[PDB]
Homo-oligomer: A and B are copies of this chain.
Amino acid sequence: AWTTFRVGLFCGIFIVLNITLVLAAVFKLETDRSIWPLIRIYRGGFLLIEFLFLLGINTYGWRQAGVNHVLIFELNPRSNLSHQHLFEIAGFLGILWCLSLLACFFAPISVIPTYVYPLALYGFMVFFLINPTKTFYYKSRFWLLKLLFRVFTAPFHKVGFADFWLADQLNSLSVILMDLEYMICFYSLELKYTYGVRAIVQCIPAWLRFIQCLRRYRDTKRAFPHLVNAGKYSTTFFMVTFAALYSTHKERGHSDTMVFFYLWIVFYIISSCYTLIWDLKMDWGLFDKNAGENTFLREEIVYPQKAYYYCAIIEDVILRFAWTIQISITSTTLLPHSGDIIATVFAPLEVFRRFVWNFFRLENEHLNNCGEFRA
Q: Could you tell me which A residues sit within 8 Å of B by CB distance?
A: 1, 4-17, 20
Assess whether B8 is in contact with A4, with CB atoms less than 8 Å apart: yes
Closest B residue to A15 using CB positions? B13
A17 to B17, CA, bound (A): 10
Chain B residues near A17 (CB, 8 Å)?
Answer: 16
A10 to B10, CA, bound (A): 10
Assess whether A16 is in contact with B12, with CB atoms less than 8 Å apart: yes
Q: How many copies does the complex hold?
A: 2
Chain B residues near A15 (CB, 8 Å)?
Answer: 9, 13
Chain B residues near A4 (CB, 8 Å)?
Answer: 1, 4-5, 8
A-B contact pairs, 27 of them (CB 8 A): A1-B4, A4-B5, A4-B8, A5-B5, A5-B7, A5-B8, A5-B11, A7-B8, A8-B8, A8-B9, A8-B10, A8-B11, A8-B12, A9-B9, A9-B11, A9-B12, A9-B15, A10-B12, A11-B12, A12-B13, A13-B13, A13-B15, A13-B16, A16-B16, A16-B17, A16-B20, A20-B20
Question: Smallest CB–CB gap between A90 and chain B, Å?
Answer: 14
Interface of A is mostly: helix
Question: Smallest CB–CB gap between A33 and chain B, Å?
Answer: 23
Chain B residues near A7 (CB, 8 Å)?
Answer: 5, 8
Chain B residues near A10 (CB, 8 Å)?
Answer: 8, 12
Chain B residues near A13 (CB, 8 Å)?
Answer: 12-13, 15-16
Closest B residue to A13 using CB positions? B12
Known pairs A8-B12, A12-B14; list 9 more (Cβ under 8 Å): A4-B4, A4-B5, A5-B5, A5-B7, A5-B11, A8-B9, A9-B15, A10-B12, A12-B12
Chain B residues near A1 (CB, 8 Å)?
Answer: 4
Chain B residues near A8 (CB, 8 Å)?
Answer: 4-12
Chain B residues near A5 (CB, 8 Å)?
Answer: 4-5, 7-8, 11
A11 to B8, CA, bound (A): 8
Most chain B Cβ neighbours within 10 Å, of A10, A13, A14: A13
A11 to B14, CA, bound (A): 12
Question: Smallest CB–CB gap between A103 and chain B, Å?
Answer: 14
A279 to B12, CA, bound (A): 41
Question: Smallest CB–CB gap between A105 and chain B, Å?
Answer: 15
Question: Smallest CB–CB gap between A179 and chain B, Å?
Answer: 28
Question: Smallest CB–CB gap between A64 and chain B, Å?
Answer: 14
Question: Smallest CB–CB gap between A11 and chain B, Å?
Answer: 6
Closest B residue to A4 using CB positions? B4
Closest B residue to A10 using CB positions? B12
A5 to B11, CA, bound (A): 9
A28 to B109, CA, bound (A): 20
4 nearest CB pairs, A to B? A8-B8, A12-B12, A16-B16, A9-B12
Chain B residues near A11 (CB, 8 Å)?
Answer: 5, 8-9, 12
A148 to B373, CA, bound (A): 68
Question: Smallest CB–CB gap between A310 and chain B, Å?
Answer: 30
Question: Smallest CB–CB gap between A206 and chain B, Å?
Answer: 40
A5 to B14, CA, bound (A): 14
Closest B residue to A17 using CB positions? B16
A298 to B125, CA, bound (A): 54
